[PDB]
């Protein structure tokens, strides 16, 4: 809501002060990565 | 009444002191206001 303004019941998080003073907005979850590096023909040699 | 004076029986509030240790002067009641107001338009709202 905007006070003393002909505007109310807006939807969507606005762009004035979204951080609420809270320091961070945490998101958790898994993360998969099947990346592939130029490993040599020698199986005993890991490229890291 | 006014004693020890030649101008006595003064009627009405003088200009000196209505405090007299009285907490306040309470006059309750009500208002009734019919006002022309532009800020209560719940109408011109965008979609979504």
Could you explain how this protein is built, in words?
This is part of a larger assembly, with 2 copies of chain A (48 residues). Chain A is largely without helices or strands and 48 residues long. Helices cover 0% and strands 0% of the residues of chain A. Chain A is rod-shaped, with a radius of gyration of 25 Å. The relative contact order of chain A is 0.12. The PDB classes it as virus. The entry lists the keywords Rotavirus, dsRNA virus, virus. Cryo-EM reconstruction of VP4 assembly from SA11 Rotavirus Non-Tripsinized Triple Layered Particle. Chains A, B are Outer capsid protein VP4.
What's the helical proportion of residues of chain A? under 10%
Q: What portion of the residues of chain A fall into strands of 2 or more residues?
A: under 5%
Question: What Rg of chain A do the Cα atoms give?
Answer: 25 Å
Number of strands of chain A: 0
Q: What's the shape of chain A?
A: rod-shaped
Number of helices of chain A: 0
Biggest sheet overview of chain A: none
Oligomeric state: part of a larger assembly
**Which two protein chains have the largest interface (Cβ within 8 Å of the partner's Cβ), and how many residues from each?**
A-B, 6 and 7 residues
Structural class designation of chain A: little secondary structure
Q: State the end-to-end CA separation of chain A.
A: 54 Å
Protein name (chains A, B): Outer capsid protein VP5*
Motif (YGL motif) (chains A, B): 11-13
Subcellular location (chains A, B): Virion
